[PDB]
Amino acid sequence: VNSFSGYLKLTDNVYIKNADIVEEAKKVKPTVVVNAANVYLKHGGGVAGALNKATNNAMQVESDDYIATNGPLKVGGSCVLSGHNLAKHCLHVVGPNVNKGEDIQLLKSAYENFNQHEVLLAPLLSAGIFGADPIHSLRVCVDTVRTNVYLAVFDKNLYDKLVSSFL
Ligand SMILES: CS(=O)(=O)Nc1ccc(C(=O)O)cc1
């Protein structure tokens, strides 16, 4: 038994809810929240900017130090940093950005990072401003992630479409 409430069970291990992932992170304080990162960890908008704003920019300050030391992530890759006031840890995962021409086949690699964590609160990778089809992102998630993943979908319209079209 864990602290996640109001989710709808899609599979043995994947759960989904209509909620802002930022708001969800503040209530639950999960062990791991996933950020929809880019390779530079520049958290300007979307999930990353909303998460970063909720940390009062501390996520960005930590991220800038991480990049100064390590250089950019890979598309499909991740790093574990602090969860600040939102979670114990933030898993920054880089899905391919379709609006930059990145290989959608990298979405599976991106979701494989989730398997290193027993339980996660996450958004749909490569959805929103990253330009991928969220229906596709949910299919890759279900077919790739084996650990317990609690997906937050902010758009109520999209949430209902994801559920009603789920195979
Ligand atoms: C409402 S918020 O901007 O504070 N935080 C969010 C939540 C979800 C998304 C998304 O694209 O799914 C983007 C930002």
Given ligand 1 and candidates 16, 17, 21, 156, which is best to mutate, with the most ligand atoms within 8 Å of its CB? 21
Q: How far is CA 104 from CA 111, 124, 132, 167, in A?
A: 12, 13, 8, 21
Q: Which two tokens stand for residue 7?
A: 């989710």
Contact 96, 126 (CB under 8 A): yes
Q: Which two tokens stand for residue 80?
A: 């574990």
Ligand 1 atom closest to residue 51's alpha carbon, by position in its atom list: 5
What residue owns the CA closest to ligand 1's atom 1? 20
Q: Is the dihedral of CA 144, 26, 30, 94 positive or negative?
A: positive
Ligand 1 atom closest to residue 54's alpha carbon, by position in its atom list: 4
- The span from the CA of 98 to the CA of 7, in Å, is 28
Q: Give the ranges where the chain is alpha helix by DSSP (H).
A: 21-28, 46-54, 58-70, 106-112, 134-144, 156-164
- The span from the CA of 149 to the CA of 141, in Å, is 9
Contact 93, 125 (CB under 8 A): yes
- The span from the CA of 81 to the CA of 143, in Å, is 26
- The span from the CA of 104 to the CA of 156, in Å, is 25
State this model's resolution in angstroms.
1.0
Contact 125, 141 (CB under 8 A): yes
- The span from the CA of 164 to the CA of 160, in Å, is 6
Give the end-to-end CA distance of the chain in Å, rounded to a whole number.
26
What residue owns the CA closest to ligand 1's atom 3? 50
- For the CA atoms of 60, 76, 88, 20, the dihedral, rounded to the nearest 10 degrees, stands at 80
Q: How far is the CA of 136 from the centre of ligand 1 (A)?
A: 18
Q: Residue for token digits 């279900």?
A: 142
CA 49-50-56 angle, 5° bins: 85
- Residue 120's beta-bridge partner residues? 149
Helices 46-54 and 58-70: angle between axes, nearest 10 degrees = 120
Contact 38, 94 (CB under 8 A): yes
Q: How far is the CA of 152 from the centre of ligand 1 (A)?
A: 9
Phi, psi of 124 (to 5 degrees): -70, 120
Q: How far is the CA of 23 from the centre of ligand 1 (A)?
A: 10
Ligand 1 — pocket residues by CB below 6 A? 20-22, 46-47, 50, 123, 127-128, 154
Contact 1, 133 (CB under 8 A): no
